[PDB]
Amino acid sequence: TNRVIIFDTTLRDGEQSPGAAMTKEEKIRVARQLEKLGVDIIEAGFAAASPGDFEAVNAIAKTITKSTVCSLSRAIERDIRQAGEAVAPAPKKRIHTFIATSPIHMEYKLKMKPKQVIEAAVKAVKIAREYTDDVEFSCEDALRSEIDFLAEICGAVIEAGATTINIPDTVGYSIPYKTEEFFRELIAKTPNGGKVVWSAHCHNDLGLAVANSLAALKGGARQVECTVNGLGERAGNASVEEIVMALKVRHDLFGLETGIDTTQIVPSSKLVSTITGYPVQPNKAIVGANAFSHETYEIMSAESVGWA
């Protein structure tokens, strides 16, 4: 379809930003607001990381109704079961597992051979399916990985039961036309790649996270991972408000739909910025104090994104 899945990881990937740690009650209040915003998936945390993380994921899984509650997990049985237990009380639940897939990370960081990396991923996915029909797998460091190896592991995890395959720009140096080509080629090479949802998780190190996200869509991805205000380590993630509004404003070029209530964009941005201490600069798209200072496209009004 033309439906783009918005996967928000403000509460997991965003909260990892220096100084951005949140209390359990702050996470719950942010999770409630993301639900009102209409994001499809709320990644609530990494249940196996500590008792506090488990408790926050679990509390969000007990709060949310209309969005899918996700937990991160390493590709290891015990972490998967932690994830599955934490999200069990949510009516819609996802487990997101990952493993590094690039030659150097595999050999010298994980110290596993490619055969072992595929076997661990398949096993993690199969265990995850005991807990939910909705399982995401990420190829960490995808863009420095061998394309043949990516097609093979993605193929294996699709067969094992993964229904969303996520490709991060781990380093953050990709350029949109290359991102688009990379998606088109990987989807084509992966056994049964047409049968699942492809996801992009882009980084803003060269100011291109949003452009690269949109390029991933043109290449065949239908999920974008992103955060309110682009909150995230280093230069940050793709910012959900920019993605959603590029798609809304230029529906004429993309023809893609989201479930987002755009009137909740500004309240979401303010709430996130207040809680985390990360200010939003004045010239920032959509939610910057100046963005509304002042054809087949749909021009945007300040009110349409929730300015008072």
| Closest to 238 measured CA to CA, from 39, 22, 28, 66 | 39
CA distance 147 to 170: 15
Among Mg ion, Mn ion, a second copy, none, the one that 13 touches (CB under a kind-dependent 5 to 8 A) is Mn ion
How many residues line the site for Mn ion (CB under 5 A)?
A: 3
Among a second copy, Mn ion, Mg ion, none, the one that 292 touches (CB under a kind-dependent 5 to 8 A) is a second copy
Beta carbon nearer to Mn ion, 213 or 237: 237
| Closest to 56 measured CA to CA, from 19, 82, 18, 17 | 82
How many residues line the site for a second copy (CB under 8 A)?
A: 53
For the CB of residue 62, give the shortest distance to Mg ion in the complex, in Å: 21
DSSP 269: H
CA distance 298 to 308: 20
Beta carbon nearer to a second copy, 89 or 288: 288
Among Mn ion, a second copy, Mg ion, none, the one that 50 touches (CB under a kind-dependent 5 to 8 A) is none
| Closest to 102 measured CA to CA, from 167, 156, 154, 146 | 146
**Which are the residues after which the chain is interrupted (C to N > 2.5 Å)?**
294
Beta carbon nearer to a second copy, 134 or 169: 169
Residue 1 makes contact with a second copy by CB under 8 A = no
Beta carbon nearer to a second copy, 157 or 210: 210
Q: How many helices (H) and strands (E) does the chain have?
A: 11, 8
CA dihedral 110→114→118→121, nearest 10 degrees, is 10
Please report, as ranges, the residues that interact with Mg ion according to CB under 5 A: 21, 275
Residues that bind a second copy (CB under 8 A): 17-18, 144, 171, 173, 175-178, 204-208, 210-211, 214-215, 218, 229-236, 239, 242, 245-246, 249-250, 253, 278-286, 288, 290-295, 297, 299-300
Residues that bind Mn ion (CB under 5 A): 13, 232, 237
